[PDB]
Write a protein that binds this ligand. Structure first.
Ligand SMILES: OC[C@H]1O[C@H](OC[C@H]2O[C@H](O)[C@H](O)[C@@H](O)[C@@H]2O)[C@H](O)[C@@H](O)[C@@H]1O
Ligand SMILES: [Ca+2]
Length: 586
């Protein structure tokens, strides 16, 4: 491990994070929206699961056009969630339970309701005009409508620009129309961003930040038209000119130094960047400890599988090997470096992992949920568990499109309708994809009980902000799973116990090697830590599947798996349907 600087222990390397989506976690006052007192009331549940830290998605004052990722005030909690004091009490309670607290840092853009933007948009001459990207129309079209400055597509569909009638110019918004991008080329803007979004929260005791689209802050000068890579779309990906831009490392170094200089008590702050995609070299420039940029990053290749590189909401075939390789992209690059990785399958933007990568049928949802837990338990990096994942939550089924809340659904739907028609092949493909891929599969209220109609998320008379998944009725809920020794929840508790007990090779293991990479069913690998070898054999299939241990001997002991403990033959070399096993040799 001397040749593996990545094995140097840090609290944030070996912490298991639990991600909370505040709108959907726990409602304490029957208004149908989750809130801070609701979260506080369930911290003991999170601690008992085996979490070491929490990350709460944005709870700052926000119109909710993008459910909190459109921030009107970095220094004020959204009143529906609580007061600033409620948040501080929540951070303290988290801390007194022995857990760390990270907050979501959303500074690529703010709400158009933010005072900075209200000032910026007021005139062409005010001191905050250049805190955003304002450009005149390219010209006007034959119908008299202004033409946007370039052809860039919003992440949620349609143009990435919004016309302002008052000043007769467009402003850039890569996200929804009320999320204007902040201009990081303006130094006064950067400094104000740091004071408000970063310094305020450091002053109030956060242990770190999850950094939202951290790879988008640097725009290529001129904001040029993007190449036409999609010939069936008016608007084109801005990625070449917005993703990992020329100043992105300069910006992250400056922000890292701001944090180091603002912390008052010498505590160690973790930053995890939601960086989307980056070559391994770029990842190393971000996460190498000696670069003083990020602690670690999320890379989305593993959650991209089965979706068109041209459009998230067009499904394409994938095979197990594609997902194996994509998962390995999170962590192989850190081998023999001072970098660090993340490990996760779910978050507030993703559908449920059982539905995507296991088998969500009544027959197999439990065992395949446990398989995914076995897999995640064994991988190197900071592990993240998303609310409901520990219950084996699955996608909702058979929802009409109008039932979806997500702005990403609404905007993409309207873009397709405008470009192709509601009754088009393009629309049919979109509707097929949302049933599998929508962010809303992550966003239905947390299922605490089998109580009708709100599953313990709120009182029985409350109207939840968003519809409940019917799965609560089928026993996917905290109350039912605690009592069931065979539940996915109880399994996750054991998986986190196993991971911690063997953390040297589970969290800090290196020299990862695939075994039988091409196998369409078997996901198998080895890792090392000094004299120890970990071997995983994981059967992502309803078929039984053979495996081999490289250099097989009697030294490989079965240490963890998802089939009943007393019924597994460790010496056998065939996995039952959806069976996973971790062996360790020392
Ligand atoms: O703050 C806007 C937006 O940023 C983050 O996600 C960016 C993008 O990431 C992936 O590509 C997903 O598939 C997209 O749906 C996301 O828009 C936040 O995580 C996201 O919640 C937010 O809306
Ligand atoms: Ca509430």
């Amino acid at each position: 491990s001397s040749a593996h600087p990545e094995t140097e222990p840090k609290w944030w390397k070996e912490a298991t994070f639990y991600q909370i989506y505040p709108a959907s976690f726990k409602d304490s006052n029957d208004d149908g929206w989750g809130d801070m007192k609701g979260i506080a009331s369930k911290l003991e549940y999170i601690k008992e699961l085996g979490a070491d830290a929490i990350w709460i998605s944005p709870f700052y004052d926000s119109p909710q056009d993008d459910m909190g990722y459109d921030i009107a005030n970095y220094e004020k909690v959204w009143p529906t969630y609580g007061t600033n004091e409620d948040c501080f009490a929540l951070i303290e309670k988290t801390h007194k339970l022995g857990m760390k607290f990270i907050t979501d840092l959303v500074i690529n853009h703010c709400s158009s309701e933010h005072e900075w933007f209200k000032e910026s948009r007021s005139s062409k001459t005010n001191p905050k005009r250049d805190w955003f990207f304002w450009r005149p129309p390219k010209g006007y079209d034959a119908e008299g409508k202004p033409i946007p400055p370039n052809n860039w597509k919003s992440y949620f569909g349609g143009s990435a620009w919004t016309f302002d009638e008052k000043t007769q110019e467009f402003y850039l918004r890569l996200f929804c129309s009320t999320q204007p991008d902040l201009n990081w080329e303006n130094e006064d803007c950067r400094k104000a961003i740091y004071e408000s979004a970063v310094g305020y929260w450091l002053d109030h005791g956060v242990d770190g930040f999850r950094i939202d689209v951290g790879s988008l802050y640097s725009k290529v000068v001129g904001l040029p038209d993007a190449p036409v890579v999609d010939k069936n779309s008016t608007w084109q990906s801005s990625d070449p000119y917005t993703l990992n831009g020329p100043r992105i490392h300069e910006f992250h170094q400056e922000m890292n130094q701001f944090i180091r200089n603002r912390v008052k008590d010498g505590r160690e702050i973790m930053t995890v960047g939601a960086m989307q995609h980056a070559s391994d070299e770029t990842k190393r420039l971000y996460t190498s400890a000696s670069r003083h940029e990020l602690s670690e990053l999320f890379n989305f290749s593993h959650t991209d599988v089965g979706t068109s590189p041209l459009f998230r909401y067009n499904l394409v075939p994938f095979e197990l090997k594609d997902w194996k390789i994509a998962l390995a992209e999170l962590f192989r690059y850190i081998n023999g470096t001072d970098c660090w990785s993340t490990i996760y399958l779910e978050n507030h933007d993703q559908p449920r992992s059982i539905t995507r990568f296991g088998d969500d049928s009544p027959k197999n949802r439990v065992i395949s949920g446990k398989l995914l837990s076995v897999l995640l338990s064994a991988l190197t990096g900071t592990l993240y568990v998303y609310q409901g994942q520990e219950l084996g939550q699955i996608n909702f089924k058979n929802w009409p499109v109008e039932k979806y809340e997500d702005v990403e659904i609404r905007n993409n739907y309207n873009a397709i309708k405008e470009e192709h028609g509601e009754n088009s092949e393009e629309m049919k493909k979109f509707l097929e994809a949302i049933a599998l891929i929508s962010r809303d599969h992550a966003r239905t209220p947390m299922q605490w009980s089998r109580e009708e109609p709100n599953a313990g998320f709120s009182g029985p008379s409350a109207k939840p902000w968003f519809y409940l998944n019917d799965s609560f009725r089928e026993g996917i809920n905290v109350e039912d799973e605690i009592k069931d020794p065979n539940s996915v929840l109880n399994f996750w508790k054991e998986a986190l116990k196993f991971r911690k007990a063997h953390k040297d090779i589970t969290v800090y293991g290196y020299d990862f090697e695939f075994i039988d990479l091409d196998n369409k069913k078997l996901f198998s690998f080895t890792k090392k830590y000094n004299n120890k070898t970990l071997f995983a054999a994981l059967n992502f299939s309803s078929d039984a599947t053979d495996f081999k241990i490289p250099n097989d001997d009697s030294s490989f002991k079965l240490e963890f798996g998802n089939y009943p403990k007393k019924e597994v033959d460790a010496s056998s070399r065939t996995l039952k349907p959806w069976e996973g096993r971790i062996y360790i040799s020392e």
